[PDB]
Amino acid sequence: MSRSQLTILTNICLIEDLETQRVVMQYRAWSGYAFPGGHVENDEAFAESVIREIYEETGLTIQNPQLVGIKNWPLDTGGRYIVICYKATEFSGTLQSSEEGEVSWVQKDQIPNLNLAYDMLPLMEMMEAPDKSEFFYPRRTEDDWEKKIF
Amino acid sequence: MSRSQLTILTNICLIEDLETQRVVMQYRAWSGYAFPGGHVENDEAFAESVIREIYEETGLTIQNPQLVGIKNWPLDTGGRYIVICYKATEFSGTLQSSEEGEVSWVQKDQIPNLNLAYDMLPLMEMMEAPDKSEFFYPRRTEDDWEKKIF
Ligand SMILES: [Mg+2]
Ligand SMILES: [Mg+2]
Numbered sequence: 055m056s057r058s059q060l061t062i063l064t065n066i067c068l069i070e071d072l073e074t075q076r077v078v079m080q081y082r083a084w085s086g087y088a089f090p091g092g093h094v095e096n097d098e099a100f101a102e103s104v105i106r107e108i109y110e111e112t113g114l115t116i117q118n119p120q121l122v123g124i125k126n127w128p129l130d131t132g133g134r135y136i137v138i139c140y141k142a143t144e145f146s147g148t149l150q151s152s153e154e155g156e157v158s159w160v161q162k163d164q165i166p167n168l169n170l171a172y173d174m175l176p177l178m179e180m181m182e183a184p185d186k187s188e189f190f191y192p193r194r195t196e197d198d199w200e201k202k203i204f
Numbered sequence: 205m206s207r208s209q210l211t212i213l214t215n216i217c218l219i220e221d222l223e224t225q226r227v228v229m230q231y232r233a234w235s236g237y238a239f240p241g242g243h244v245e246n247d248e249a250f251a252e253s254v255i256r257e258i259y260e261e262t263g264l265t266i267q268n269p270q271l272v273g274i275k276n277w278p279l280d281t282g283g284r285y286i287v288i289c290y291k292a293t294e295f296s297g298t299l300q301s302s303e304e305g306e307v308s309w310v311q312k313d314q315i316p317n318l319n320l321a322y323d324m325l326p327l328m329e330m331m332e333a334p335d336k337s338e339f340f341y342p343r344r345t346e347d348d349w350e351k352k353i354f
Contacts, residue, residue, distance in 0.1 A: 061211035063284070096282045099340040100274060101354035119354075121337030123271065124250060124288070132246045134213070138274070187271030190249040204251035204269075 058130035065104040066091035067119060067140040068181055069112065076159035078112055078149070079168065088171035090157060091137075104140050112157050113150030116142035122181040127191035139181050173201065208280035215254040216241035217269060217290040218331055219262065226309035228262055228299070229318065238321035240307060241287075254290050262307050263300030266292035272331040277341035289331050323351065 066089040069078040080090040092107030094100060101119060108116050125137040151157050160168065166175060173189075180189045180203050188204040216239040219228040230240040242257030244250060251269060258266050275287040301307050310318065316325060323339075330339045330353050338354040 061213070063211070096284075097278055097342075099338060099342070099352060099354060100276065101338050101340070118335070120335065121271070121273065126250065128247055134246075185268070185270065188249060188251050190251070192247075192249070202249060204249060 056131055058133050060129065060133045062133070062135045063094035063100075063138070064092060064136065065094065065100065065107060065138045065140060066125075067104050067108050067116065067142055068122070068178065069108065069114060069116060069142050069145060070162065071145075071159065072143050074159065075162050077162050077165065078114070078157055079160045079165070080111065080155040080157050082155050082171065084172045086171040086174070087160075087165075087168040088174060090155070091140075092154075094138075100138050104138070108142070109147075111152050111154050112147075114145045114147040117144040117146075118142070123187040123189060125177060125180075125189040128193050139177075141181060172199075176201065176203070179203075206281055208283050210279065210283045212283070212285045213244035213250075213288070214242060214286065215244065215250065215257060215288045215290060216275075217254050217258050217266065217292055218272070218328065219258065219264060219266060219292050219295060220312065221295075221309065222293050224309065225312050227312050227315065228264070228307055229310045229315070230261065230305040230307050232305050232321065234322045236321040236324070237310075237315075237318040238324060240305070241290075242304075244288075250288050254288070258292070259297075261302050261304050262297075264295045264297040267294040267296075268292070273337040273339060275327060275330075275339040278343050289327075291331060322349075326351065326353070329353075 079087045090111040094103040104119050119140040119142040122141045123139040180186045190202045229237045240261040244253040254269050269290040269292040272291045273289040330336045340352045
């Protein structure tokens with residue numbers, strides 16, 4: 055019945071242009087600059103979903119997106135929010151914003167200087183680390199946004 | 205309401221003893237030899253779940269399990285079955301079966317000679333491949349068990 059009982063399936067992608075050392079950032083009015091991505095449709099694969107969402111949100115067609123981790127947290131009544139995290143360096147197309155947010159190429163080394171969504175930097179660190187694959191909020195108490203990286 | 209509307213969260217782990225080149229296999233009366241693992245509890249992280257399930261099913265405590273892919277397929281009415289796939293080479297303990305299946309160390313090169321669960325070999329191949337991370341059944345028709353690897 056309640057929203058806190060649901061399992062929500064979403065994705066994000068770190069799209070990195072190796073020629074320019076820039077990454078696609080999206081501005082979402084949690085608030086701030088974050089990675090683009092979206093919700094998984096009922097019939098589509100996880101990889102199909104990230105390719106489709108990225109195309110819609112950025113105008114870019116990514117190839118062979120790589121699974122780099124999972125961000126997730128329990129909801130209040132047995133539910134869970136799930137973010138499947140991808141990295142893509144192979145893509146084509148022209149960058150184009152959508153109603154879902156303004157997108158831009160930001161120099162990767164300048165990402166920390168933006169108004170970032172909460173925990174963007176440790177999330178990007180988990181994704182980039184070859185030996186880490188999960189970012190979890192235990193949500194042990196109602197205000198607990200402490201994280202665990204596995 | 206129906207079981208085909210649910211999102212089911214499970215894990216498996218390929219536990220490889222690098223000293224002996226054996227892998228833990230579990231016999232489940234889909235039927236056949238498969239990897240051990242289990243269902244994710246409401247409050248636990250994905251990594252916590254695989255460590256706990258593997259301990260219960262095998263007696264081994266795995267350390268630092270690595271995400272190597274996701275096996276998944278849609279269910280008939282908007283649901284999805286999800287298997288988070290891990291590999292672990294660091295562990296301790298003594299192998300011990302449980303009510304959930306007999307476990308054994310099988311030489312990795314002898315795995316194909318077992319009565320394996322359906323698609324075990326391509327699943328293991330997806331997991332072992334550094335550039336593949338999803339095993340998906342589109343379930344386009346009712347008898348369609350064709351697969352896609354991303
Ligand atoms: Mg989106
Ligand atoms: Mg099990």
